[PDB]
């Protein structure tokens, strides 16, 4: 998927986590978030289309998804251990990071 | 190691996991897979030898090994909790990913 | 912060771990190490400042930080399992990896 569609998937699944009732739903949403963050590493935001693919700006873009992926990892471990409330709080932090990346590159 | 030798290491350790008897053996195999996948990220596979290292095709190749690394981690989290059969079930997804990568890039 | 400041942050938190008494302290220092390693991954280290951003040397630099991030992850797992002494021994190995990277790219 292109970058904005992958960001939409991240946001849709943050809402699923915020409203979730059990650990299985949280786990499923986090797995979708991970797949979207990895796919977005292959994307180029429109404002960077005129940059080299390994320009410092595009490295910052890709490593920003690495930052999200490690936070997704913390939340997904918490969900897998049944720590649903901790996973949801972690998702609130994920929301902050996703928004910051959106604002930086759109 | 070059790409093909890393791919051999990935398949050899998938076979170890399939037959493994305890969590320590699964953890050991998965750690070797992780090391081989990180090493292959620095390689150029046969199909991409006509592409530059920072080409979009090579970025997509490296992100494909990032995808494999997070799948390896799903099995590793299960093994660290001692859920050996569940970790082995997770390793089946690893098999699909490794085989697809082999066919795509050899 | 620049790359060298992140390498300093990695060493400050290694010292925090070496003197730690409980798992939460070790976990906190390792989380700070993860953040610093991720910030450093997007930098250009002093030794490679004369290389093109699309150089293979810069890809090997970035993949070296992925290797470090997975070593940090393993120590963090040990701390999350409450294995403080094992986590500290793993962090002693981390000190080697971090300082070796520092000396390689400064
Ligand atoms: Bi773990
Ligand atoms: Cl790159
Ligand atoms: Cl990158
Ligand atoms: Cl974990
Ligand atoms: Cl990449
Ligand atoms: Cl890279
Ligand atoms: Na071979
Ligand atoms: Zn890269
Ligand atoms: Zn983990």
SS (H, E, C) C83-105: CHHHHHHHHHHHHHHHHHHHHHH
Which tokens sit at A43?
């994307």
Which tokens sit at A4?
């904005």
What CATH number is attached to the domain comprising B70?
1.20.120.10
Q: How far apart are CA C34 and CA A71, in angstroms?
A: 10
What is the crossing angle of helices B84-105 and B56-80, to 10°? 170
By the CB criterion, residues less than 5 angstroms from ion ligand 1 are B 77, 80; C 77
Could you give the C-alpha distances from C106 to C12, C39, C49, C64, in angstroms and in order?
18, 16, 10, 14
List alpha helices for chain C, DSSP H: 3-18, 23-41, 56-80, 84-105
What is the crossing angle of helices B84-105 and B3-19, to 10°? 150
Q: How far apart are CA C101 and CA C59, in angstroms?
A: 14
Chains touching A by CB (3 or more pairs below 8 Å): B, C
> What phi, psi does A42 have (nearest 5°)?
-90, -5
- For residue C70, which residues of chain B lie inside 8 Å, CB to CB? 34, 38, 69
Domain limits at B34? 3-105
| Apex A35 CA angle, B29 and A13, nearest 5 | 130
Question: How was it solved?
Answer: X-ray
Of A34, A42, A80, the CB nearest to B77: A80
Q: How far apart are CA C56 and CA B98, in angstroms?
A: 24
Task: Using the CB atoms, write b or e for C55-90: b if 16+ within 10 Å.
Answer: beebbebbbbbbbbbbbbbbbbbbbbeebbebbbeb
**How many domains are contained in chain B?**
1
Return the closest-CA partner of residue B76 out of B60, B59, B63, B93.
Answer: B93
């Amino acid at each position: 998927a292109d970058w904005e569609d992958n960001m939409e998937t991240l946001n849709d699944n943050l809402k699923v986590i915020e409203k979730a009732d059990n650990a299985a739903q949280v786990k499923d949403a986090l797995t979708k978030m991970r797949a979207a963050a990895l796919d977005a590493k292959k994307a180029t935001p429109p404002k960077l289309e005129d940059k080299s693919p390994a320009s410092p700006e595009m490295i910052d873009f890709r490593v920003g998804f690495d930052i999200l992926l490690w936070q997704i990892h913390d939340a997904l471990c918490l969900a897998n251990e049944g720590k649903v409330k901790e996973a949801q709080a972690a998702a609130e932090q994920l929301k902050t990071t996703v928004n910051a990346h959106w604002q930086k590159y759109r």
